[PDB]
Design an enzyme around this catalytic site. Structure first.
Site, mmCIF file in Angstrom:
data_model
loop_
_atom_site.group_PDB
_atom_site.id
_atom_site.type_symbol
_atom_site.label_atom_id
_atom_site.label_comp_id
_atom_site.label_asym_id
_atom_site.label_seq_id
_atom_site.Cartn_x
_atom_site.Cartn_y
_atom_site.Cartn_z
ATOM 1 N N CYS A 65 -2.615 4.232 -6.278
ATOM 2 C CA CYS A 65 -3.332 5.365 -6.834
ATOM 3 C C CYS A 65 -2.511 6.629 -6.701
ATOM 4 O O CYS A 65 -1.637 6.724 -5.832
ATOM 5 C CB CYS A 65 -4.665 5.542 -6.123
ATOM 6 N N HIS A 107 -1.872 1.154 -1.401
ATOM 7 C CA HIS A 107 -2.666 2.346 -1.652
ATOM 8 C C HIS A 107 -1.706 3.516 -1.804
ATOM 9 O O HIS A 107 -0.571 3.473 -1.329
ATOM 10 C CB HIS A 107 -3.626 2.620 -0.489
ATOM 11 N N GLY A 108 -2.155 4.568 -2.474
ATOM 12 C CA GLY A 108 -1.379 5.796 -2.501
ATOM 13 C C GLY A 108 -2.211 7.010 -2.840
ATOM 14 O O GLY A 108 -3.429 6.911 -3.062
ATOM 15 N N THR A 159 -8.923 -0.050 2.739
ATOM 16 C CA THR A 159 -9.439 -1.370 2.361
ATOM 17 C C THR A 159 -8.337 -2.351 2.027
ATOM 18 O O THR A 159 -7.250 -1.963 1.601
ATOM 19 C CB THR A 159 -10.352 -1.317 1.120
ATOM 20 N N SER A 160 -8.627 -3.633 2.219
ATOM 21 C CA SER A 160 -7.672 -4.667 1.868
ATOM 22 C C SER A 160 -7.535 -4.738 0.355
ATOM 23 O O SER A 160 -8.504 -4.554 -0.383
ATOM 24 C CB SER A 160 -8.099 -6.008 2.452
#
Lengths: 233, 4
Positions: free
Chosen positions: A129, A87-88, A28-29
């Site tokens: 994350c 993100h992660g 997701t953006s």
């Protein structure tokens, strides 16, 4: 007892800001991340870092950027700062098209691989994350190690999601910038980061129409391999 | 609020 911070330059601050991801990845953006990146740019500019903002990098562009920066001559620079906004998952930050192992990125800067940064603080600030747990909270040879002089200021505890507000930016980066603005002329960096921990832990709580995600909390995680105190003044 |  404290790092030498009066080289001619404070050093580079590299900000990698990944907002939009390739459709095929399904990611997701990250609405609100541009607010973080702008806040970080101004915060570090005021601390006299040479800021370079990078947006929407693929996994290979991230690796190539870090490799290139690690091959620069940092002899006149006091320190190095890298900020990753993406993100992660555990041990991983995402490029726009797939994951990058954080160890691969950080290895370029080891004491034996980036000699012009040997003995100088290398700071990695990560908003991403680290898993999918949610915190429900509770009411009320050589001469120095090659892994020395790294600090990882992670937005959230190991295993947990990290929270970002689409309007205000991420909880951690919002707080980090506020505390740096307020205390960089007064407090040692570990004490600034402790105040960030308290601000995130006490002042933020998620609001969601989805009960699974509602009323959740966050604690950042400071990981220090530093050998001296770090003052920006 | 969203997660990363």
């Amino acid at each position: 007892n404290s790092y030498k911070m009066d080289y001619p330059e404070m050093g580079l601050c590299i900000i990698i800001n990944n907002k939009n991801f390739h459709k095929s990845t399904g990611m997701t953006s990250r609405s609100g991340t541009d607010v973080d990146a702008a806040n970080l740019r101004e915060t570090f500019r005021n601390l006299k870092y040479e800021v370079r903002n990078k947006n929407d990098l693929t996994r290979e562009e991230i690796v190539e950027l870090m490799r290139d920066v690690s091959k620069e001559d940092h002899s006149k620079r006091s320190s190095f700062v890298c900020v990753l906004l993406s993100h992660g998952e555990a041990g991983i930050i995402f490029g726009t098209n797939g994951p990058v192992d954080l160890k691969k990125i950080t290895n370029f800067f080891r004491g034996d691989r980036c000699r012009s940064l040997t003995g100088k603080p290398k700071l990695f600030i990560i908003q991403a994350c680290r898993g999918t747990e949610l915190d429900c909270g509770i009411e009320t040879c050589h001469k120095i190690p090659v892994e020395a002089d790294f600090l990882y200021a992670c937005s959230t505890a190991p295993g947990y999601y990290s929270w970002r507000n689409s309007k205000d930016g991420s909880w951690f980066i919002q707080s980090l910038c506020a505390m740096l603005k307020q205390y960089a002329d007064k407090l040692e960096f570990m004490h600034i980061l402790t105040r960030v921990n308290r601000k995130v832990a006490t002042e933020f709580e998620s609001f969601s129409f989805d009960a699974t995600f509602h009323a959740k909390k966050q604690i950042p995680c400071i990981v220090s391999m530093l050998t001296k105190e770090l003052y920006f003044y | 609020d969203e997660v990363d």
